[PDB]
XYZ file of N, CA and C in Angstrom:
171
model
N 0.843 -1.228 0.000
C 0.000 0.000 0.000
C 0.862 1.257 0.000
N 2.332 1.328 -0.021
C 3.109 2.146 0.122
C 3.573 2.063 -1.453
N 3.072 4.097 -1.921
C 3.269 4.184 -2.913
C 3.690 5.270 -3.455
N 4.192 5.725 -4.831
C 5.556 7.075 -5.041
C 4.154 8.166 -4.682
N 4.894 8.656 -4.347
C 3.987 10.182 -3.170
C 3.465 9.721 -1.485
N 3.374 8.821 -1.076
C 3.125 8.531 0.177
C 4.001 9.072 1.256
N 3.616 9.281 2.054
C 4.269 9.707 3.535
C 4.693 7.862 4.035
N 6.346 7.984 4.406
C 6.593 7.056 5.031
C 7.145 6.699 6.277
N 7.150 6.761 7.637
C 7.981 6.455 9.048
C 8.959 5.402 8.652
N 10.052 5.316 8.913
C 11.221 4.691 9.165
C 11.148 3.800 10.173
N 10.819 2.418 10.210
C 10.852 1.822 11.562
C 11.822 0.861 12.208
N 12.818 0.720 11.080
C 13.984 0.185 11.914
C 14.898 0.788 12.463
N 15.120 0.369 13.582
C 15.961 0.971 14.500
C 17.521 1.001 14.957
N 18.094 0.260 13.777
C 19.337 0.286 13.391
C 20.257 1.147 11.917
N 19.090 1.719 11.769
C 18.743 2.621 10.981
C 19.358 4.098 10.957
N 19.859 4.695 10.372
C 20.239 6.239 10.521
C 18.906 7.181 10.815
N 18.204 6.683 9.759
C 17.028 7.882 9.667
C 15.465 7.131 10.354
N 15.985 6.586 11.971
C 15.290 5.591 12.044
C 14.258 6.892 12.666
N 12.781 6.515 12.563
C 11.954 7.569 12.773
C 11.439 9.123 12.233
N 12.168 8.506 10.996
C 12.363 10.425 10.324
C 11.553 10.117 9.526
N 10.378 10.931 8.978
C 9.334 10.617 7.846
C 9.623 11.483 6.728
N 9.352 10.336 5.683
C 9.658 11.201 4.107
C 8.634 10.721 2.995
N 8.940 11.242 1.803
C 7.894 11.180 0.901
C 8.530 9.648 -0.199
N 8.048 8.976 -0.491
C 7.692 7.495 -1.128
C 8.417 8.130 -2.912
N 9.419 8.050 -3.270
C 9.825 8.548 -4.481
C 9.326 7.661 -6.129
N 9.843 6.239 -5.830
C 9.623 5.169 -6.460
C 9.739 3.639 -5.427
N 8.810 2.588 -5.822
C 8.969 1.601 -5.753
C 9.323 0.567 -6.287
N 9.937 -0.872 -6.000
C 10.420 -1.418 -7.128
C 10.965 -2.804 -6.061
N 10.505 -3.958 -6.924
C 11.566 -5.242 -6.361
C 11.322 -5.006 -4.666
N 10.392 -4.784 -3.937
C 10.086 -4.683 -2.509
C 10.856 -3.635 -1.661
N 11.359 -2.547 -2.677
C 11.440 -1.691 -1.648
C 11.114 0.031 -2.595
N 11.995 0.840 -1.385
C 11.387 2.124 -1.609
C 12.345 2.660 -1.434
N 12.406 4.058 -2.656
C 13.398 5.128 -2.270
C 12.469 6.469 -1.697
N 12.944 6.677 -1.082
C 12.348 7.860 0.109
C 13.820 9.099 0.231
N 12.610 10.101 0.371
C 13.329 11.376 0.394
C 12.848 12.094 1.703
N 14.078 12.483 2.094
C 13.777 12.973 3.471
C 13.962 14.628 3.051
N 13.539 15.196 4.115
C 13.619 16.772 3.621
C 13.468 17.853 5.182
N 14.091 18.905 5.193
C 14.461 19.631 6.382
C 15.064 20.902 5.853
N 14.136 21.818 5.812
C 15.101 22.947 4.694
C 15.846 23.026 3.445
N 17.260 23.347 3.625
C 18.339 23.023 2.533
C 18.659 21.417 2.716
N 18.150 21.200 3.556
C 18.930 19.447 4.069
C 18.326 18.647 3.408
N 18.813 17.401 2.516
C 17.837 16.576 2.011
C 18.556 15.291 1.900
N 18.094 13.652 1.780
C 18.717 12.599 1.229
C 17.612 11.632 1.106
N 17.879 11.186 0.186
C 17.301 10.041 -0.709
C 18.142 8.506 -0.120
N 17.042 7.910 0.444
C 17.591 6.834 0.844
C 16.367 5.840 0.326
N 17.151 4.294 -0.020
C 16.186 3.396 -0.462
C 16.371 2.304 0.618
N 14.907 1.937 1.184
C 14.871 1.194 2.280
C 13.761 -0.612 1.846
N 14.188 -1.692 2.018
C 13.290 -2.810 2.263
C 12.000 -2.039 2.893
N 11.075 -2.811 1.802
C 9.220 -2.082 2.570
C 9.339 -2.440 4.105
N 9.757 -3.545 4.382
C 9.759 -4.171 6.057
C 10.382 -3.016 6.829
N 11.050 -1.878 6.484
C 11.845 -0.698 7.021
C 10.828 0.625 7.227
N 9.622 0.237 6.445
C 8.666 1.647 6.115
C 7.213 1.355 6.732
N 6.589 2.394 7.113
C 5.464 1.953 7.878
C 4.314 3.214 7.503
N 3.579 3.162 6.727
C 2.391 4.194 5.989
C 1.930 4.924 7.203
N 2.013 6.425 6.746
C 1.489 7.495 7.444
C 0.522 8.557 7.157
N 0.050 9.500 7.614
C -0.871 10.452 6.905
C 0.200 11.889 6.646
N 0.448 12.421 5.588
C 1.275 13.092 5.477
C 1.797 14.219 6.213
């Protein structure tokens, strides 16, 4: 159900950006690249779906 434009939580906890929510870029092969965002600050990280947990934006 996690799809490119979705709001996503980070839920692993070994994780850098564990808990940081970002927007769903593309999906593909069971996972997701997600973009995190904070001002000028930004990174694109691609996480296993088992790493992402659907949110309301």
């Amino acid at each position: 159900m996690i799809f490119p434009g979705a709001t996503v939580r980070v839920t692993n906890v070994d994780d850098t950006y564990y808990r940081f929510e970002g927007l769903v870029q593309r999906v593909s092969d069971g996972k997701a690249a997600v973009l995190f965002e904070n001002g000028n600050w930004d990174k694109l990280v691609t996480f296993r779906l088992s790493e992402l947990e659907a949110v309301k934006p």
